[PDB]
Symmetry: C4
Subunit: 196 residues, 4 copies
């Protein structure tokens, strides 16, 4: 068993690091099963040469909507749950992490099947906020996922490998995804079918 | 589909911006139905020439009250729910947003009918707190809505329009509202009637 | 109706203010009924010549305890609920406020009767944290209430008075309390009695 | 009764203090009963010569896992509950505190018996974040507990002693633990047995 963080708080990642360079999000986001729950996931990179303290991830769904009373809201925003309730949005960012939004009843994608996806007009804004340790100052990074950038039935490729008592990140594969068997029904549709 | 935020985190609003100038709240607040729920809503402007990180909205109700034991609290404060529970008060402020407080059982307006409104002695203090990205420092903006400034049965006019692959804001209409069909009963009264 | 906060965010308190001087907590804390609920309350002062942004109140109970397994914890700490769940601990501090902890089942005082109070060995640490607007920096103020400093069956005297379209604070009375009719049974005892 | 904190916010710990020196976590973590609940606990030290404001503790479980769909997550992170829900992770750090994670159904250790412990490949990362009062800046401290560093059926030795109206900390014993009678069944196993 090779430790991830040593007793003194120093992490064992990127052999010979120094703990502006910019933080990256994967180009695409994927949707696929994790433990019988359907999920939307995107990857968030670290900063090779500093920690980010009080680091947090959040996401907004941007989608123009019409209320049952006919009020039209251009580019309405609602929050996507990526760990707010359990503090799993309080990231320990010391290597690329896959953030996961479980597609449940209060999720906006609850009624969206695979066929249905490309028909929807929406954008997922991902927003990472923290305090760059070295800089002293509060930073923010953002990105965006549009309908055509969400890949149904895929998973993120692993990027973490242990080499010589240090964990190294194959950054080439950061953005890379592979296909996996994934039902094509909506989260709602799977739940109904599951319940009889 | 024209993106709101580009892959690199740069938003497509206010063609040719630079991302002290002061943040504005609409002059008035409106109350009206959104998806069968009665709502109080106010608009919060952005800062044309910077983002506001770790941006959050909150509101206090100021109203002198008397306890069932006869204790009089001048200008008592209680919190108005504008997304605290679901992180929808964690704003992504890159254009004017309508903030919405759904008038439910734990809301202070739950028992307030249209006729009843102008009789009540109360004030809604809205408070926006964030970290002006360019400035480095934590800012706070406030405003106030008194009974006579709350407009029952109205909605905010849309201000967002897509022009030339950039979203522009018709700031003339920022404060403007229009009337819409809205029952005159209290949220409580509508619920009771609804439940038989 | 004289506004508390004007449209531009400027409050109408302390006619002719400038918005180190130190923030004060009342010397004593009181326990008494508010709307059929028993409460512990302490007063927290403002800073006459600046706002405090992202202001929050919290309290710890310090009391040495012994676990059912015989482990002795000197000066154990547990959190006192003063609005954490509903964001009513996110203070809008622009004049002295009475903070209230409702003495319910999850409260530590739930089983403490009036007679019982002076027998208990405990301390309430109150801690106010914010960002002094003028200073730019994060501040913290603390105080302490010991058994003998908690006054059962009392209330805080009002200190807020409207004079000449500005709200003034009679700081002489900041610390002053008066007696009021208050049962002597514990919160638990009142609940049981209430439930038959 | 000797006060822990005086009326003016000054604490009565470390007679003759000044309120870089580094913050320490105990070398080991222990698991044992507190009030019929099984717990994992680690100790977190203070900074002798300053307070830490907006201080908070959090912990991540690092453990490589495989999803029921065969996706392998190297060094997956999930949050350990150390008071997030009740604000007991908002520390009042003015002397060494034992932080406690109660091993309940949503805890990752729920199914881990004593025998089972040394077989598991996992790491507990503890992360303390605050604002060093004197420094003005936001700090972060971290440490790590691996399987072999978790001591089953033990407790932390008390380190706090009252001497001459000041509380002193016997820092020699900071890391020291003693054994105590503790069942060897998992939290799950104890619950089942308990429920008949
Ligand atoms: Ba902060």
């Amino acid at each position: 068993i090779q430790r991830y963080v040593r007793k003194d708080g120093k992490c064992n990642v990127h052999h010979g690091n120094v703990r502006a360079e910019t933080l990256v999000f994967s180009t695409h986001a994927v949707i696929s099963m994790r433990d019988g729950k359907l999920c939307l996931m995107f990857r968030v990179g670290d900063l090779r040469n500093s920690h980010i303290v009080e680091a947090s991830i959040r996401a907004k769904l941007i989608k123009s909507k019409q209320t049952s009373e006919g009020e039209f809201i251009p580019l309405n925003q609602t929050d996507i749950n990526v760990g707010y309730y359990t503090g799993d949005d309080r990231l320990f960012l010391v290597s690329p992490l896959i953030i996961s939004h479980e597609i449940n009843q209060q999720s906006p994608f609850w009624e969206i099947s695979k066929a249905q996806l490309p028909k929807e007009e929406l954008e997922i804004v991902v927003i990472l906020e923290g305090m760059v340790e070295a800089t002293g100052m509060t930073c923010q990074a953002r990105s965006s996922y549009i309908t055509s950038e969400i890949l149904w039935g895929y998973r993120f490729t692993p990027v973490l490998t242990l080499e010589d008592g240090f964990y190294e990140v194959d950054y080439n594969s950061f953005h890379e995804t592979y296909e996996t068997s994934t039902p094509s029904l909506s989260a709602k549709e799977l739940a109904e079918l599951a319940n009889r």
